Write a protein that binds this ligand. Structure first.
Ligand SMILES: Nc1ncnc2c1ncn2[C@@H]1O[C@H](COP(=O)(O)OP(=O)(O)NP(=O)(O)O)[C@@H](O)[C@H]1O
Ligand SMILES: Nc1ncnc2c1ncn2[C@@H]1O[C@H](COP(=O)(O)OP(=O)(O)NP(=O)(O)O)[C@@H](O)[C@H]1O
Ligand SMILES: Nc1ncnc2c1ncn2[C@@H]1O[C@H](COP(=O)(O)OP(=O)(O)NP(=O)(O)O)[C@@H](O)[C@H]1O
Ligand SMILES: [Mn+2]
Ligand SMILES: [Mn+2]
Ligand SMILES: [Mn+2]
Ligand SMILES: [Mn+2]
Ligand SMILES: [Mn+2]
Ligand SMILES: [Mn+2]
Ligand SMILES: [Mn+2]
Ligand SMILES: [Mn+2]
Ligand SMILES: [Mn+2]
Lengths: 465, 465, 465
């Protein structure tokens, strides 16, 4: 689609409102709605003004003015608007320079794909994210000077087997770790997952499947096809938007947080990736697990830069409650085929070169997909260019100190980024300015506020002392 | 039906979602939904991937990847999906070998029918299961360190004759043991049972009848026609699925547990069986109760291997609360005609050779029908091949030590399986690997957790001591 | 007092019950009561048996049997027993060897004082602990799979200024950080603090003063005089016992946890210390702040070994919520006079050599005083023996990276103990066995369980992502 085709669309269908969407630095979709007459040919080049100082991690009040540039290829009707509204995904333009903004995650993402094409290694990188979530019926949290609390609830919750329910308690509550994937009446989310899957398809997302996940009390997963870097990060943002909004439609609440439930499965975002040139898969070969030496080298980079990569792929203190040794892994920095306990997994493809890829299991859905994907690409490329030996595969379950480990906290991942960021910066994709502001925002707004707050389990262990 | 006919069905009717169903080792139906484009000709041979390590009693995390192979003959529309969804029953393929998985109960089931055809004794085995259930209006259970509780409820419950009900208490609550089979207003489940019966018919199940059962407080039964081994175990899984899901539709809850109610009828799954060759009934003859010597020998095997058979036909600790001497039997290992107190019953057929069969009364609906049916077939065949004399019929009600008895607990049935499993393994149907993992899963997840937990009746007997 | 004088006491006053008290490894007082006839002359040498395998961090089930040896000098009447009960503090004897148990904190403490006397540096070490606490009216905490919560309450709590109270809300609730030290009706704890002070005096504790502390909602402090190492750690255990028990008497609850309240003062245990020989103060001199070179060197050791010392003086994850840069310090490893923002403070003595001492401000009341005091003594001695220059004093409020900092977590303090423990072990005071079991107990029972549990503030930051 083109700027003129989108403008013809608005005229023919008499669309009165345009909803322009764009991501912020941490990873939250922002929006502004406009009356149809506000969008012209120039909106697709010069962009539409807004305050860049109210968006987290961007401009300072003194240099506030920024521009929203919508992508015509993203235009669809937002089903969640009573009034027929056309929705587009934007990239951010600096009005002072007229160039794309260096802190815009969607700009960084495009720059990463431009860099890949520049090296001659490949022309396309396919990303296939797998974002698990929880479908909750209630959420109550807070923390005052004399209190700290959270209470998550779901009808599927095993903690609710003995409770009085309105007309009445119908049983079939999945047991802890026992939600993957018994039929209804255990699975209460079939109709909703199909709706979430079908509505995002109409948004332009390539859809595949859906299933109930391991955890009791609403853990679910929707399966979407891979796509090119920017397109894939655009697809994850839509994915997250429709799921949250269909949940709200049916009076429910969704969270993509890694560990909302203690002693049950966390929500991870396993990300499948492969490099391609002239339509041919470059990760197909005759080496380990039917991979090519390039594919082994891409894993090399991923595994070597994994601690730094975690500052972008697992950017929350909560990420580290899931990335704990034992439950359920991937804490250990190694590759393997079929092994779902290893950081990098080589799925078993049915002898098809087109299906040959690596699954980086460490990431979770709290990440900015534009930043996470660009970072993983950079580590991958550096791995082929340096030409990082991933070591030997580990084809076992659960001496364990011989294998390098992932950071155990957010500050540790931020430390690993300060030490190892040349594979990102030296490229031009991420600016040293952005990498520094990322560490600073995460330390001041997440690491430090958390260190200050008493944890309720500290009463369980320490009230008597 | 064929893979192409199913694919033509999806194209012509514009079916967007495909629901693939498969059983786990203990006996719970699992599922995964796919967008239409994910199912092609190759899905019917190579299968569709999934995690075999999250399914109870299967693969270990290190060797996780498995394949779902749908059966085209099982395709129907799942009525419980708002969105028109096509549903198929799968068998599990090992992607490493390309062969059918040895722990897949549906594979074991097919292997059992392949074995029967291999012996030349018969070409077909007809199984007619009779699974009673309870239709409850409420269920609350739990067990903490300082508590253990369950509270089952139904409007039909005799325990509710003196309670205040919303506008108001309409009486006609069946008395204990007095539910078989007074008319409405006593029987409150006529409309629902007809719906359960008619919807499963549309799923491809051969339907016969329905009635209210002996127990007060929702005991019911739906009658379905016999079918070939795999088809019959497929029919029982559908049977259980529609009943549970129509109950959920009308805000009610179903249990197939053997003994949910104390001092009232348990839920048993009487299983009628007969061998056939070239369309002719092989259990018709001029011996006892109009049976053939082969039929007498098949009973021989069943009765001889019955204690081991119970590790598969009655695989729960709760099974043994129903299989108690007195209420209501069949605890005594003997055959008889018309006698509903004997383990094996020869029903009175109207002088029709086609209706000549044995009714093994011991089983209950907690069993995996694929495992239970394959096991009973194996014991039957071994009985004809060895050529086990069933002894003499016992045509009496209620010296009693002269007759061999069934195990009194789950561990006892598991003990009997360790001692007597050659009739299963030596065949090739069940692998010694599967038989060992079955005992281990049942001991670690059911027998041992139960031995640890205080029973509320232990307070009734022992609080003062 | 002697074993015979204690036995004469029991006979003359007709005391029927004897309460023998002893500390466990983490720092909790344990007890066992005996009928008078059970205590004879041999109880004061051979000791009284008990199970050393049920006490945290001690014997294994196979080598369980241990002995309690009471100290006659600790005998007093426990006021909290309706029946006149004589109470004594014990040390633990190994019955296998007949020697004092190497994991007994009270034995380690005596060994530390024996070591000081062995070096010829001094004959006496005086410890003056200052343990702040909170006096709460209510405490509710818990953490399930779907929840985590704590709710602390007090009538003094500023969070309660707008609440309906029984007949009625009388105001005068101290403001946050504004509790030190307005008069009544603001201070509601005058009578109780006097009772806590007077009852511990009758227990044999040298008492000095009492005041309301900085924090709103019940923060209090009782002032006690210094004493010799073991005597001082005995005095802190009594201090903690009477405060908790007088609170219980008046239907209230006390906590010595470092940070129960967010955004208000933590509970610290500032510990004043000085070495003496032949009745003369050795920390009096003509150097900085009227100190001696020995005193400067003792600070040297303290400051150098402070990160390792924190594994014993601040042994909880909660300790690190108080030891946070800013609120209120001492995070910075430096000495100064009058400065209450420095780790080590030299209080202003009124030109009296007898009052010349250092105040290590880092410790909190979650510590085992026997372990904390022995550790600080060892670091002090090593400082004089090596002859560690403490650096130059920092006489400022709040470049800041030039000054060495304390660990930011419990694992970090445990890391610092593994690297620096020779000043403890090489001495003989702490065994390498004890130092290893300490790290292991803290990692397995506190550090690792905490890393697993979602924090409620993680919902505040991450629910939307
Ligand atoms: N060559 C490829 N390059 C990148 N992504 C791919 C490639 N092939 C498949 N994918 C995608 O990776 C994702 C994987 O889904 P799936 O096919 O179920 O693999 P999976 O490993 O079995 N999923 P899971 O079981 O949760 O780990 C999908 O988005 C696929 O489209
Ligand atoms: N020759 C046969 N082989 C196997 N099953 C059969 C055969 N004939 C009938 N059945 C089935 O066995 C089941 C028996 O139902 P039914 O006809 O009511 O017998 P029943 O003994 O009276 N039932 P019940 O009273 O509950 O024990 C049905 O599924 C029949 O289809
Ligand atoms: N020479 C000494 N050696 C060891 N301890 C001492 C010595 N002199 C006084 N102390 C003790 O140290 C503790 C200090 O209490 P205090 O006299 O109020 O000093 P402080 O610094 O003003 N207290 P604070 O304001 O809370 O820091 C008391 O236990 C004193 O007895
Ligand atoms: Mn998943
Ligand atoms: Mn998947
Ligand atoms: Mn995955
Ligand atoms: Mn029946
Ligand atoms: Mn019947
Ligand atoms: Mn029957
Ligand atoms: Mn104080
Ligand atoms: Mn003081
Ligand atoms: Mn002080």
């Amino acid at each position: 689609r083109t700027p003129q085709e989108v403008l013809k669309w608005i005229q023919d269908e008499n669309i009165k409102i345009i909803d322009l969407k764009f991501i912020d630095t941490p990873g939250i979709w922002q929006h502004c709605s406009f009356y149809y007459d506000q969008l012209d040919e120039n909106s697709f080049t010069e962009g539409i003004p807004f305050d860049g100082s109210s968006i987290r991690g961007w401009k300072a009040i003194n240099e506030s003015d920024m521009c929203m540039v919508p992508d015509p290829n993203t235009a669809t009707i937002d089903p969640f608007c009573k009034e027929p509204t056309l929705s587009m995904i934007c990239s951010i333009k600096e009005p002072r320079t007229g160039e794309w903004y260096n802190r815009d995650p969607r700009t960084i993402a495009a720059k990463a794909a431009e860099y890949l094409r520049g090296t001659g290694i490949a022309d396309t990188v396919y990303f296939g994210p797998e974002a698990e979530f929880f479908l909750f019926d209630d959420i109550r949290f807070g923390q005052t000077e004399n209190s700290s609390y959270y209470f998550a609830d779901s009808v599927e919750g095993r903690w609710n087997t003995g409770r009085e329910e309105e007309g009445g308690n119908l049983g079939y509550k999945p047991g802890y770790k026992q939600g993957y994937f018994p039929v209804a009446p255990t699975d209460t989310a079939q109709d909703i997952r199909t709706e979430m899957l079908l509505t995002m398809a109409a948004f332009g997302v390539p859809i595949e499947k859906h299933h109930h996940e391991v955890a009791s009390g609403g853990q679910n997963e929707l399966g979407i096809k891979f796509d090119k870097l920017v397109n894939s990060a655009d697809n994850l943002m839509i994915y997250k938007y429709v799921i949250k909004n269909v949940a709200k439609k049916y009076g429910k609440t969704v969270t993509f947080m890694p560990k909302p439930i203690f002693n049950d499965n966390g929500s991870g975002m396993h990300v499948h990736q492969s490099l391609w040139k002239d339509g041919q898969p470059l990760f197909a070969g005759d080496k380990y697990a039917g991979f090519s030496q390039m594919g082994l080298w891409y894993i090399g980079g991923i595994l070597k830069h994994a601690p730094a990569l975690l500052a972008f792929t697992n950017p929350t203190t909560n990420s580290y409650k899931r990335l704990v040794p034992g439950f359920e892994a991937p804490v250990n920095l190694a590759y393997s085929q079929g092994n779902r306990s290893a950081s990098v997994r080589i799925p078993l493809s049915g002898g098809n070169p087109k299906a040959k890829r690596l699954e980086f299991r460490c990431p979770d859905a709290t990440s900015n997909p534009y930043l996470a994907f660009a970072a993983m690409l950079c580590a991958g490329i550096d791995g082929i260019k340096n030409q990082i030996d991933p070591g030997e595969p580990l084809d076992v379950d659960i001496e364990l100190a011989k294998i390098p480990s992932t950071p155990g906290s957010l500050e540790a991942a931020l430390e690993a980024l300060e030490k190892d960021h040349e594979f990102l910066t030296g490229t031009g994709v991420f600016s040293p300015d952005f990498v520094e502001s990322w560490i600073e925002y995460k330390l001041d707004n997440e690491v430090n506020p958390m260190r200050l707050r008493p944890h309720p389990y500290e009463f369980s262990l320490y009230y008597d002392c």
